[PDB]
Scaffold this active site. Structure first.
Site, PDB file in Angstrom:
ATOM      1  CG  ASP A  59      -2.008   1.048   1.185  1.00  0.00           C
ATOM      2  OD1 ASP A  59      -2.128   1.780   0.178  1.00  0.00           O
ATOM      3  OD2 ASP A  59      -2.748   1.167   2.183  1.00  0.00           O
ATOM      4  CB  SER A  60       3.127   2.826   2.415  1.00  0.00           C
ATOM      5  OG  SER A  60       3.675   1.740   3.140  1.00  0.00           O
TER       6      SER A  60
END
Ligand SMILES: CCCCCCCCCCCCCCCCCC(=O)OC[C@H](COP(=O)([O-])OCC(O)COP(=O)([O-])OC[C@@H](COC(=O)CCCCCCCCCCCCCCCCC)OC(=O)CCCCCCCCCCCCCCCCC)OC(=O)CCCCCCCCCCCCCCCCC
Ligand SMILES: CCCCCCCCCCCCCCCCCC(=O)OC[C@H](COP(=O)(O)OCCN)OC(=O)CCCCCCCCCCCCCCCCC
Lengths: 51, 173, 83, 49, 495, 91, 458, 167, 114, 106, 68
Positions: free
Chosen positions: C38-39
């Site tokens: 996600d990050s």
């Protein structure tokens, strides 16, 4: 030329302002107020000398 | 022009440059060229006006006044005699202003002349200028009656205090 | 004084695909959509242009940057590119 | 016509200036003063009253 | 042979006892500073032909800057104190047209607002010394002031000293120069180097035949300039702009010249002004070509080494930076050395010599900071390397300065009539060790720059006292004095 | 309900009100306002005669001072306006 | 004035007598011809005094003051034509005649020869100015401000008739200021205090104080069409010169009670400058500036002893041109933005670059650039009250520092970006907008060439 | 703003604050993956306080010791010369009043200038036809259909579709 | 100093229905841009937030006002307070200077100006 | 000619929920932390219902602020809290209150 | 090449301004300047002290100037 681009620039206002000073000293009682001689010997502008 | 006793100064006393060296100096090249480029456009035109300005003459005359009364005339509530005395006194004050301006630049004649010593010489202008302005604010400066101009009604009455309280109330002078 | 056109960014967005060693130089050129690669994959993929371009990358630039040519699209609107 | 709304109205200035000497010609009180301004013997303090 | 002159051209209005007309002054500063001041301006407009080359508003700049010379030149030629007050304000009103060159920009127009604020405090001190000359001295021409020296010059000359603090960047008014840098670059090369800051102390220099006695003056003067040195030294540390690093460095030059007044050294003080004007109008312009080369970062971050096809301007900096270390034999050697070695014979606080001489190292570490971070390391800055150094317009400017720059202190002082008596005694352990103070600044900055580059990886700890890189003065006074007076003390006694 | 006038610019120039003879409102205020008042009236007070009798007292001060400096006459007297003309009432 | 009121009264049967729209170009044309006649017969010499003709004129000998009175009528007609042209012609011509009638009483005033003709002429105004506030003004709350424009000046001026006739029946006659040679002194009593009180307090109604001045930001805030009579209201406030006529004599020696007029006009001086840095109105912005350095002159007069009459002569005309010019700036930028609130004017300096020079030099007359007519007189106020005591430079110097911010607080408001709005305000500063904006500094710096005529007796 | 994307707003600036302090490039680059191992503590978990206590201790040591005068990328909300180009400042539509012989130049530009106006002069039979329809009552951010269901012109025509270019 | 300024707080899940406060302003923003975009406006927006600003600040404060509290009579400590104090300075002034001007002298003798 | 709620009125408890927002939408439905309760303390000449003060304040500071112009330059519609002190003022930096400058001057 | 079109508001009315400003100020200012030069050369004043002027003094025109 370098014939009139500087002659109109600098060579013309010379005579006007010098006339504004020669016609100024004879009118105003305080002209240029130049200082003393600062002379250590005695010289030919005077008659005596100094050691 | 003017009169030299009004504006005295000692003589100029300019020495010799004393070059003493065979090195080329630029002062023998500047004064030998620039003098003629000024004398031609100035002095000849100054001569050209000099014959032209002498074409006609015009006169303007001195204005000398008439002063018959001085101080004590006249009686209190009058108008006529107390109007010429105002023209007396007030024109006897604007003269006394610019007399000081002569003595003020007389100090300025000494200071930009010596420069180096400038304090321990000239022997008068620290004294005589302070023998004028000190003898000025007394009885000739309406302090602080100068707003209403003190016209003959307070300039005499400071001098009433300069004779009644002064010089008699010293107990006992 | 040097101008700029459309062809400079078409080099650099395609180049950093191969500069990042996690992404091989066998993907699609302009539209890889980044979910198939996600990050640190929506920020690290543009943390290199934080080094090279680096105009502070505002908050709305994350959710648009999935389509990798839609990255390239608004820069010409920002950088005022030719014609 | 000949435009009395125009410059005829600034022509009233000398119409006022012609009346402006009537007050001075009845202020003929004093000639004998001592501010020279004396009216001693001359035709110069007499004139322009 | 001297022949100093005054003139008597044309009357102004006259009043009761005094009459001022106009006059001029040709003593020791007109025949000295004016060919120096014009030579700098003669060599500065070619860069603005290249710096402001893309602006159709080019014609306003050369028009506005020339009148700024007029208010700078009529002040030094004056000899009436009315005429000094004309130039004292004329120099500030041009500045609002120079910091406010770029419109908008919500800090730079505020920086134009910050500029004229601190200028007015220096205005109210000078008029206080004016009116005391009216009450006593019967005029305010500079002749009759120096004709008789009064007894109590303590009351007027503090206003003369407070007038100096308005524009010569003393303590308490110190954010005026780091805020004025926001405009264009040769604007700030003129605003900060040879104009707007030499006239703040120039008025004190004219007042030399009075400043000898009245001993409350001299202790306040030299202690004030000592404060101005090290607070500019501690706040310049960890500063991330080239122009801001050079901004503090002219202020520690001011810390010298404030102390040179309290010691009775008039002309040796002014000779430091004669040398210093060469320096930063070169240096901001030499660094201005670097910023225009990259065209947008102006940070000490992301610079690289010196030799990225950059031969000449790196040679131009090391002429300037080594002079800025503290003059071993460079440009201002005959002025810097003859003053700190004139601090041998003195009567100071003795905290002053324990404060002025330490900043000589702090001046030297300013030099290598742009060497070690912009001229030394590996090349790093963003791409499309569009560098350019080929314009003979700029080459004409740099070559004209450095020929005159190196021969600045070595031709002028070579031929001068002497005024005072030198020291001529500089004993053991007391003579030249301030040069050694400059040497260790190379050493100390080395083991910080290399340690921040090559070490055993000293990890970034968030624990530090960082009230040094800010100064804490703009943090609160720009948040309190426009808050108490502007809001609470107004709206209570408003409507 | 609401009728008002807006920017008078029907692609003409405009000086004060409109096109013609109101066009003359320019050169009746350009030529009469300045160029006669700001020129001739500026010239008129330039060489205007002696204000408050000053120029007489300039050269009059030049004359009388050296006459006091001539023989014995002191300067800045403040001499009670010819004394012994006041009885000076004591109390 | 031999024939100065005489040509200008003939200008009155020319408005409704004339044709259509020719009435503007005709009225301006005749008006400038009187301006030379003003210059010609005046400015004579000059040594105490020029009693002019008779019992109606003393020629304004000590202070000329009368040239400034005659610029304005050929200066506001070009200004009032901004928003006036919406009415009937007979109604518009009445608005022309009442402003011309305002000048005629003020032409006889400022010279006035006397005191019993003074007060009837001192009160001969306030009749035409009040009608201008009532009809053809701006939005509502006019009528209370018209009542505050009365009931102060009339409230204070009525004891002058109590004072003057009490002088006329007591000592001689006040027809002649020059038959005021015999003046008895005034000692401290409990009757003579009020004699000085009524002699002075009416003159504080017009040039304001920290008290009793709430009406002044009403007429300038709620004002006629575009600064029309507001320019005349500048001369209406500075035209309270008559303290120079009266208190020069006629109890001069009562200075024991001068102090609460010195002090109140001094802390109120520094206060009312800062009372407008949070104001939200343009026409109120110049109004509170016009209080401060107009309150500067009062301590120059009650403190006597010249080097104070010198600057105070010049400080009346100092803002008298300047604040008149600032109102010309404020009368503009309102035909284009129909609200006078200053905050809405973000995003200027780009649409109007030509008038942007005029913003600079106008506000450069408050910083005032010491070779001007402004800082040549404020240095003499310094030269007077420092001889009073050493403290007076402090509160008076900060006045030179607060208006440094307070003037540039307006200039920076012009410089903003993208302007958000304004499909109107297109007009790039037409001929009427900039020719009328001229002729203010054009005589002002002209007077700074040889400022000899701007000097009292003094 | 949501809890999951609150991590993202800190994650970019966590490394952006670090390159302010570095001296080399690799010195900053070595601490990128070195700081990533701290981010790799909790890889994927629930969204509760266990994910908030990772952020509740990210209050300290992120604001604590944060960016001693960092890099600013000068064309930004802050930074020097951020709005420096203001002598030009793009006065779009300052060109209404000309009074020609000043409109002599650019003949074809003015002929195209009135051309684009018909796109704005005729849009409210289409844009206002959907402006009453697309907004339900008074709800959220009011962009139209980005094709306007036949032809999107613009919807933001023309002050945004001809917005100010920078130079 | 001024301020901390508390730029961070807690959430998840305090006041779940508090959102869409932008729905108040985006409806006005839709009312803004629809007023802003039109082929012929030629004038300023009414903008009643500035209408309700100055008129409820310059006026309508004296109808709001009552002297029902002494913190409204608190202006006596700021207006007339220092106004007595400057005279309390100045009444001590000008007379001590006068007594040294009346009895004894201190001035220079060349004080014509003044 | 806007007469309906043309300014504030003698508040703040004349059915304060019917103040915001029947007009002068400082609050949405009188629970937005900006309902016109914040008449500081009244009795004085402060603000009444006053779509005015103690709303969230101390800066409009020209932020990034892209969803409208909305910071200080570009006219958001109706969010007036306080003005004429903020075109030159800002928010909090990284350090905190500590008056070390007096110790630095010590 | 890189070629665009600069955006100016208007130059017509602004350069129409300063025309009659410059025009009328030279329409009568420059022609009146010759009389300040012609009266300087051909006309002067001389000299001082006093003159005696006969018995009755001269009229007005006591000035040492051409036009004064
Ligand atoms: C095609 C070619 C045509 C040929 C044209 C003719 C050739 C040129 C003419 C020759 C020069 C005359 C023009 C005057 C300037 C020089 C004056 C001078 O120095 O001689 C002294 C001479 C003085 O006479 P004087 O015999 O030596 O002694 C008499 C006095 O006692 C002396 O004392 P004073 O009382 O005069 O006091 C000094 C002072 C005091 O005078 C004043 O300042 C008073 C005026 C302001 C009073 C306040 C008014 C407020 C309302 O006077 C001055 O101001 C001199 C400064 C320069 C003149 C001011 C220009 C104003 C415009 O002339 C004057 O000063 C008279 C002033 C009249 C000004 C006229 C200005 C004309 C300008 C025409 C337009 C030109 C525009 C050119 C633009 C070019 C492109 C940029
Ligand atoms: C309140 C009014 C105060 C008046 C008190 C009475 C004054 C008086 O009696 O006259 C004083 C005096 C004349 O009376 P006297 O003392 O006998 O002198 C010898 C001549 N018979 O000498 C005088 O005539 C002095 C004349 C001036 C005093 C009258 C005006 C004073 C009131 C002005 C104050 C300001 C106005 C206040 C009212 C307006 C505002 C509401």
């Amino acid at each position: 030329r370098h014939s009139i681009f500087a002659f109109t620039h600098v060579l013309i206002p010379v005579w006007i302002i010098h006339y504004y000073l020669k016609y100024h000293v004879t009118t105003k009682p305080y002209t240029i107020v130049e200082k003393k001689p600062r002379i250590f010997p005695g010289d030919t502008i005077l008659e005596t000398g100094e050691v | 022009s003017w009169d030299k006793d009004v504006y005295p100064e000692p003589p100029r006393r300019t020495p010799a440059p004393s070059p003493q060296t065979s090195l080329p100096n630029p002062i023998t090249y500047l004064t030998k060229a620039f003098d003629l480029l000024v004398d031609r456009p100035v002095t000849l035109v100054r001569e050209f006006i000099e014959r032209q300005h002498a074409k006609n003459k015009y006169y303007y005359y001195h204005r000398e006044f008439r002063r018959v009364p001085d101080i004590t005339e006249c009686q209190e509530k009058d108008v006529l005699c107390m109007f010429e005395a105002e023209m007396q006194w007030r024109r006897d004050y604007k003269v006394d202003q610019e007399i000081v301006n002569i003595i003020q630049e007389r100090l300025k004649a000494c200071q930009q002349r010596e420069g180096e010593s400038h304090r321990q010489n000239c022997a008068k202008e620290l004294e005589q200028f302070t023998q004028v302005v000190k003898a000025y604010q007394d009885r000739y400066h309406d302090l602080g009656a100068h707003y209403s101009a003190r016209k003959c009604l307070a300039k005499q009455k400071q001098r009433m205090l300069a004779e009644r309280k002064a010089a008699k109330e010293a107990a006992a002078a | 004084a040097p101008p700029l056109t459309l062809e400079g960014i078409k080099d650099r967005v395609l180049y950093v695909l191969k500069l990042y060693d996690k992404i091989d130089p066998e993907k699609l050129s302009v539209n890889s959509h980044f979910m198939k690669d996600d990050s640190l994959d929506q920020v690290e993929i543009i943390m290199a242009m934080e080094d090279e371009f680096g105009f502070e990358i505002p908050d709305i630039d994350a959710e648009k940057l999935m389509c990798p040519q839609e990255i390239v699209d608004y820069i010409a609107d920002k950088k005022d590119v030719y014609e | 016509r000949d435009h009395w709304v125009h410059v005829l109205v600034p022509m009233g200035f000398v119409f006022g200036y012609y009346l402006d000497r009537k007050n001075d010609e009845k202020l003929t009180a004093f000639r004998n003063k001592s501010l020279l301004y004396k009216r001693e013997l001359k035709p110069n303090e007499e004139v322009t009253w | 042979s001297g022949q100093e002159l005054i003139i008597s051209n044309w009357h102004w209005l006259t009043i009761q006892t005094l009459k001022l007309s106009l006059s001029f002054k040709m003593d020791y500063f007109s025949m000295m500073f004016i060919p120096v001041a014009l030579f700098v301006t003669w060599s500065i407009m070619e860069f603005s032909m290249w710096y402001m080359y893309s602006d159709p508003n080019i014609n306003k700049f050369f028009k506005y800057l020339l009148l700024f010379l007029i208010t700078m030149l009529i002040l030094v030629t004056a000899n009436n104190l009315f005429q000094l007050f004309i130039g004292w304000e004329g120099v500030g009103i041009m500045s609002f047209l120079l910091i406010g060159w770029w419109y908008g920009r919500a800090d730079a127009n505020t920086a134009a607002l910050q500029a004229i604020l601190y200028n007015r405090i220096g205005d109210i001190g000078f008029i206080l010394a004016m009116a005391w000359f009216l009450t006593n001295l019967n005029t305010w021409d500079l002749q009759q002031i120096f004709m008789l020296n009064p007894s109590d010059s303590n009351m007027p000359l503090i206003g003369l000293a407070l007038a100096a603090t308005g524009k010569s960047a003393q303590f308490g008014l110190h954010p005026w120069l780091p805020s004025a840098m926001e405009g264009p670059t040769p604007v700030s090369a003129l605003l900060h180097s040879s104009t707007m800051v030499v006239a703040g102390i120039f008025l004190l220099i004219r007042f030399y035949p009075l400043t000898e006695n009245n001993k409350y003056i001299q202790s306040i003067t030299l202690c004030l300039g000592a404060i101005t040195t090290l607070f500019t030294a501690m706040c310049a540390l960890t500063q991330n702009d080239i122009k801001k690093i050079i901004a503090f460095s002219t202020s520690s030059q001011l810390g010298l010249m404030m102390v040179t007044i309290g010691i009775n050294q008039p002309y040796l003080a002014f000779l430091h002004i004669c040398t210093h004007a060469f320096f930063k109008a070169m240096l901001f312009m030499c660094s201005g070509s670097i910023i225009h080369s990259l065209n947008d970062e102006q940070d000490i971050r992301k610079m690289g080494g010196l030799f990225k096809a950059m031969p000449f301007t790196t040679t131009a900096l090391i002429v300037g930076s080594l002079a800025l270390t503290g003059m071993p034999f460079l440009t201002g050697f005959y002025s810097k050395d003859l003053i700190i070695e004139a601090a041998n014979t003195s009567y100071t606080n003795a905290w002053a010599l324990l404060m002025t001489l330490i900043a000589t190292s702090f001046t030297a570490i300013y030099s290598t900071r742009i060497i070690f971070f912009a001229l030394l390391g590996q090349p790093r800055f963003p791409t499309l390397v569009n560098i350019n150094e080929n314009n003979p317009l700029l080459i004409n400017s740099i070559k004209r300065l450095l020929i005159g720059s190196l021969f600045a202190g070595y031709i002028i002082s070579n031929n001068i009539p002497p005024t005072t008596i030198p020291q001529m005694t500089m004993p053991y352990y007391l003579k030249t060790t301030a040069l050694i103070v400059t040497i260790l600044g190379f050493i100390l900055a080395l083991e910080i720059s290399n340690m921040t580059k090559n070490l055993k990886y000293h990890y970034p700890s968030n624990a530090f006292k960082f009230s040094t890189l800010l100064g804490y003065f703009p943090t609160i006074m720009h948040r309190l004095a426009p808050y108490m007076n502007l809001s609470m003390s107004q709206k209570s006694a408003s409507s | 309900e609401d009728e008002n006038l807006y920017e008078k610019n029907p692609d003409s120039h405009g000086y004060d009100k409109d096109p013609a003879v109101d066009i003359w409102n320019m050169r009746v205020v350009f030529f009469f306002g300045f160029s006669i008042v700001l020129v001739l009236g500026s010239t008129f007070v330039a060489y205007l005669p002696d204000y408050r009798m000053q120029e007489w007292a300039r050269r009059e001060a030049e004359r009388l001072v050296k006459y006091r400096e001539a023989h014995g006459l002191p300067i800045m007297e403040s001499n009670c306006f010819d004394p012994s003309k006041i009885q000076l009432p004591e109390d | 004035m031999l024939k100065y009121i005489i040509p200008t009264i003939m200008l009155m049967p020319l408005t409704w007598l004339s044709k259509n729209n020719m009435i503007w170009v005709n009225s301006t044309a005749h008006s400038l011809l009187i301006s030379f006649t003003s210059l010609l017969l005046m400015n004579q010499f000059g040594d105490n005094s020029l009693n002019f003709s008779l019992l109606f004129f003393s020629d304004s000998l000590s202070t000329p003051l009368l040239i400034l009175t005659m610029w304005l009528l050929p200066l506001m007609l070009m200004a009032s034509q901004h928003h006036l042209s919406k009415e009937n012609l007979t109604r518009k011509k009445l608005f022309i005649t009442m402003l011309i009638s305002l000048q005629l009483f003020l032409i006889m005033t400022f010279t006035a020869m006397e005191l019993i003709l003074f007060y009837i002429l001192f009160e001969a105004t306030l009749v035409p100015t009040l009608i201008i506030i009532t009809r053809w003004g701006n939005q509502t709350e006019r009528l209370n401000a018209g009542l505050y424009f009365l009931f102060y000046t009339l409230a204070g001026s009525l004891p002058l008739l109590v004072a003057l006739i009490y002088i006329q029946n007591t000592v001689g006659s006040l027809n002649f200021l020059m038959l005021q040679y015999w003046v008895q002194p005034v000692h401290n009593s409990w009757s003579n205090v009020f004699m000085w009180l009524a002699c002075m307090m009416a003159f504080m109604v017009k040039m304001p104080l920290y008290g009793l001045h709430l009406w002044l930001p009403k007429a300038h805030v709620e004002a006629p069409i575009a600064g029309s009579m507001v320019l005349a209201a500048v001369l209406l406030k500075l035209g309270g010169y008559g303290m120079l006529r009266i208190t020069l004599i006629l109890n001069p020696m009562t200075d024991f009670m001068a102090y609460p007029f010195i002090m109140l006009s001094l802390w109120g001086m520094i206060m009312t400058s800062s009372i407008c840095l949070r104001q939200t109105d343009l026409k109120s912005l110049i109004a509170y500036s016009s209080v401060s350095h107009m309150a500067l002159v009062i301590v120059a007069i009650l403190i006597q002893t010249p080097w104070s009459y010198m600057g105070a002569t010049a400080l009346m005309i100092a803002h008298g041109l300047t604040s008149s010019m600032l109102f010309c700036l404020a009368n503009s930028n309102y035909e284009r933005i129909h609200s006078r609130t200053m905050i809405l004017a973000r995003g200027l300096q780009t649409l109007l670059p030509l008038m942007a020079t005029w913003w600079l030099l106008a506000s450069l007359t408050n910083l005032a650039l010491p070779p001007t007519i402004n800082l040549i007189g404020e240095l003499f106020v310094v030269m007077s009250t420092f001889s009073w005591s050493n403290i007076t430079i402090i509160l008076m110097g900060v006045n030179m520092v607060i208006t440094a911010l307070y003037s540039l607080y307006m200039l920076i408001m012009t410089q903003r970006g993208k302007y958000t709005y304004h499909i109107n305000n297109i007009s790039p500063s037409f001929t009427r907008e900039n020719a009328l904006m001229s002729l203010h500094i054009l005589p002002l710096l002209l007077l700074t060439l040889n400022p000899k005529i701007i000097l009292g007796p003094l | 703003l949501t809890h999951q994307q609150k991590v993202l707003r800190l994650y970019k600036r966590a490394l952006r604050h670090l390159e302010s302090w570095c001296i080399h490039r690799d010195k900053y680059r070595y601490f990128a993956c070195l700081l990533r191992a701290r981010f790799d503590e909790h890889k994927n978990e629930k969204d509760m306080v266990k994910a908030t206590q990772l952020l509740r201790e990210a209050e300290e040591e992120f604001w604590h010791g944060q960016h001693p005068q960092p890099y600013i990328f000068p064309e930004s909300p802050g930074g020097t010369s951020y709005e420096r180009y203001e002598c030009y400042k793009v006065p779009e539509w300052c060109l209404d009043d000309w009074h020609p012989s000043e409109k002599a130049m650019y003949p074809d530009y003015f002929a195209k200038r009135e051309q684009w106006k018909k796109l704005r002069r005729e849009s409210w039979e289409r844009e206002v036809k959907q402006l009453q329809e697309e907004t339900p009552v008074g709800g959220p951010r009011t962009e139209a259909l980005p094709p306007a269901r036949k032809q999107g012109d613009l919807p933001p025509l023309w002050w945004h579709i001809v917005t100010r270019p920078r130079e | 100093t001024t301020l901390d300024p508390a730029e961070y707080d807690i959430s998840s899940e305090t006041r779940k229905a508090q959102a869409e406060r932008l729905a108040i302003r985006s409806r006005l923003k839709r009312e803004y841009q629809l007023q802003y975009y039109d082929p012929s406006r030629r004038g300023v927006i009414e903008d009643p937030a500035l209408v309700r600003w100055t008129y409820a600040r310059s006026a309508n404060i004296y109808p709001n006002f009552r002297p029902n509290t002494k913190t409204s009579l608190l202006g006596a400590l700021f207006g007339i307070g220092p106004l007595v104090f400057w005279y309390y300075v100045f009444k001590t002034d000008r007379d001590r200077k006068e007594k040294l001007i009346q009895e004894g002298k201190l001035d220079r003798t060349f004080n014509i100006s003044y | 000619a806007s007469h309906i709620t043309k300014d504030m009125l003698p508040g703040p408890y004349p059915k304060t929920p019917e103040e915001r927002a029947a007009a002068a939408k400082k609050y949405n439905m009188r629970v937005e932390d900006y309902e016109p309760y914040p008449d500081d303390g009244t009795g004085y000449g402060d603000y009444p219902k006053l779509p005015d003060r103690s709303q969230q304040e101390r800066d409009p500071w020209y932020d990034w602020d892209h969803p409208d112009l909305r910071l200080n330059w570009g006219e958001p519609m109706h969010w007036d809290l306080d003005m004429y002190i903020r075109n030159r003022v800002d928010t909090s930096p990284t350090p905190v209150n500590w008056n070390l400058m007096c110790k630095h001057l010590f | 090449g890189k070629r665009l079109f600069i955006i100016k508001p208007s130059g017509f009315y602004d350069k129409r301004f300063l025309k009659l400003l410059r025009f009328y100020i030279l329409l009568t200012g420059i022609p009146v300047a010759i009389g300040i030069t012609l009266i300087n050369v051909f006309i002067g004043e001389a000299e001082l002290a006093e003159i005696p002027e006969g018995y009755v003094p001269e009229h007005w025109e006591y000035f040492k100037h051409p036009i004064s």
